[PDB]
Amino acid sequence: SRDYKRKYEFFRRKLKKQNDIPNKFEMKLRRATVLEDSYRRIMGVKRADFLKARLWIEFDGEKGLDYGGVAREWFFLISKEMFNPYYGLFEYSATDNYTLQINPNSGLCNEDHLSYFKFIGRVAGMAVYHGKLLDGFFIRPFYKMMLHKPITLHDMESVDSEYYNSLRWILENDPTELDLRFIIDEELFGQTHQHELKNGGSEIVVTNKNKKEYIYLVIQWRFVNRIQKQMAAFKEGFFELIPQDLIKIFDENELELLMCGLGDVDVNDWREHTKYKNGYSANHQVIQWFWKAVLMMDSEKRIRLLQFVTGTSRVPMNGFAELYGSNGPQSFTVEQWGTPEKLPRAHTCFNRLDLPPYESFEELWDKLQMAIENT
Numbered sequence: 118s119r120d121y122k123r124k125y126e127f128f129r130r131k132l133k134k135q136n137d138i139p140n141k142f143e144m145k146l147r148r149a150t151v152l153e154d155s156y157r158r159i160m161g162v163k164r165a166d167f168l169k170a171r172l173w174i175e176f177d178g179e180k181g182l183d184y185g186g187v188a189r190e191w192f193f194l195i196s197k198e199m200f201n202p203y204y205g206l207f208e209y210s211a212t213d214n215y216t217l218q219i220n221p222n223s224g225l226c227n228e229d230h231l232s233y234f235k236f237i238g239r240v241a242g243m244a245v246y247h248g249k250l251l252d253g254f255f256i257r258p259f260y261k262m263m264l265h266k267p268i269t270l271h272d273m274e275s276v277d278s279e280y281y282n283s284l285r286w287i288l289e290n291d292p293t294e295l296d297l298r299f300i301i302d303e304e305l306f307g308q309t310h311q312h313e314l315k316n317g318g319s320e321i322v323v324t325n326k327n328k329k330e331y332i333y334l335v336i337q338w339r340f341v342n343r344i345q346k347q348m349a350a351f352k353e354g355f356f357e358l359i360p361q362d363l364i365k366i367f368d369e370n371e372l373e374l375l376m377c378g379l380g381d382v383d384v385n386d387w388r389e390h391t392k393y394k395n396g397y398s399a400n401h402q403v404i405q406w407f408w409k410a411v412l413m414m415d416s417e418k419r420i421r422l423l424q425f426v427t428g429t430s431r432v433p434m435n436g437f438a439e440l441y442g443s444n445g446p447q448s449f450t451v452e453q454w455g456t457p458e459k460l461p462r463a464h465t466c467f468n469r470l471d472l473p474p475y476e477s478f479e480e481l482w483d484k485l486q487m488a489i490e491n492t
């Protein structure tokens with residue numbers, strides 16, 4: 118089979134251009150109401166295929182800009198809004214994670230919530246159709262639901278590890294003597310909430326004979342049952358732009374990468390194909406601290422550092438041994454430039470981090486992550 122790169126190019130060949138469509142899609146929005154205005158237009162088009170036209174976007178009556186860049190800005194701005202937990206469509210999967218899942222209480226904000234999921238679906242499809250990325254990472258089960266792949270216990274590990282270990286225990290041992298029932302206790306607002314996994318579930322005991330069912334119903338309750346209509350509205354919109362036949366070529370990792378640009382970076386591969394100049398070296402103290410800092414950063418923040426130094430996020434194929442700059446090949450490198458008072462600067466055309474010789478690890482962390490806060 119093909120690898121991701123060939124897969125993508127194959128996918129692009131199959132995604133045929135739209136003939137029977139106006140040569141552009143005009144929408145004029147206002148930054149302060151970018152959600153309401155984007156929604157109204159994109160959900161108002163005669164046909165979804167109008168969205169496949171080249172994107173002619175205009176913010177606030179500001180006339181005369183490069184539409185390839187204004188659109189990229191829109192994808193960034195509309196993502197920020199759609200995926201803000203304030204609105205109640207999406208919420209963080211856990212207190213300790215940066216990943217997003219559908220909020221099952223979405224309907225309480227807005228009775229009309231489902232049509233907003235279709236909108237988000239269309240915009241996601243538009244990102245994929247025109248080759249731009251959404252700004253936001255979803256939980257793995259979001260990506261599997263899109264591909265109609267089964268949600269597994271393995272998918273619980275990435276989200277909630279303590280809960281995954283209780284269910285793995287149950288899987289690997291006989292739970293009969295625990296006297297567990299076909300119910301789920303949930304903690305909300307400092308109260309206990311018990312839900313039937315099935316009819317008369319409180320009176321049915323979990324054993325080795327029915328536990329595979331048990332684990333399945335749990336996983337469903339956690340990731341599917343309360344969010345079926347929302348996801349189904351999101352998919353309808355998404356599939357109005359990308360035929361679901363075509364998306365099945367990718368698996369859940371490749372799909373995340375396609376839509377959003379993961380998100381899973383081997384820091385060892387990063388470290389062993391790096392150069393050092395202007396006094397720095399493989400074992401210099403400042404460089405040790407740099408590699409410590411990177412190690413402890415969020416996989417989201419590691420990428421935002423890579424975006425800053427490279428140009429955009431997209432680790433090359435075969436790892437960091439084949440990184441390219443502007444003119445030909447260019448390995449990731451660090452140069453001892455400037456003085457501790459100034460932040461680090463990046464030359465994207467030479468994939469190089471100009472890094473001052475800082476005196477402390479925490480100073481390095483302070484200055485490095487300030488200079489990343491821009492993209």
Ligand SMILES: */C(=C\C(=O)OC)CNC(=O)c1c(C)n(C)c2ccc(OC)cc12
Binds near residue numbers: 220222223230
């Ligand atoms: C509802 C409270 C909550 O988080 O419960 C799940 C808050 N959401 C909104 O007030 C809201 C606003 C201001 N806008 C423009 C919305 C559009 C769509 C939705 O759909 C859920 C909610 C919105």
